Design a protein around this nucleic acid. Sequence first.
DNA 1: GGAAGCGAAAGTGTCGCAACCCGAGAGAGGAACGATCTCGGGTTGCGACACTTTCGCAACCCTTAATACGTTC
Length: 155
Amino acid sequence: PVISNFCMYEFDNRIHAACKKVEITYTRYADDLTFSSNIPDVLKAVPSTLEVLLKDLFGSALRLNHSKTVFSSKAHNRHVTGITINNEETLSLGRDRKRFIKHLINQYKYGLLDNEDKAYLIGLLAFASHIEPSFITRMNEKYSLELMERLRGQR
DNA sequence: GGAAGCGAAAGTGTCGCAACCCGAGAGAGGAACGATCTCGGGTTGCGACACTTTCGCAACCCTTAATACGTTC
């Protein structure tokens, strides 16, 4: 991981410098170049810049995945490295995952959830609390506070 | 990267069919010699197709991993 991060330091620096001028923010989770902006029709030229910079730096060793270049807007689904971005411009787990978690908690309510699924639900709830703290409050309201407290356990 | 099988893709040879040629022959006419149409090989050109070569998909995962629960690369 650290070698991979260092080998892309110059690429990250040059891409960030180019993107800040055109009001584009750039992040990379070591394989996922994410570019976003509020200016329309500004992200069209980003892939060409990426290709020319990669050819300048790494030659033919590192290449973009052209089948993995996706344009998205508020008209469609928007998720970055697993976190859905809402039309309200806030982080979310996605409606489908939230309904799955709700079903898991409902199954735990009637005692139809086994130990493996219970541990999976506890891990998912911790991840949700990290990502969507308001979802925990909503589940506390919907499924009562005592049920949630017994599900997460006590120290 | 690439077993083992197998099939795609492209190139090359081959082989049968058509088209024609050329000599032999029975004998039309009409009064003889041999016109004319056919029989039997033989040659050549051509194109469909079989055969030949190369490439590429992707087993396994090497001695050599860790094992609370969840996302991400």
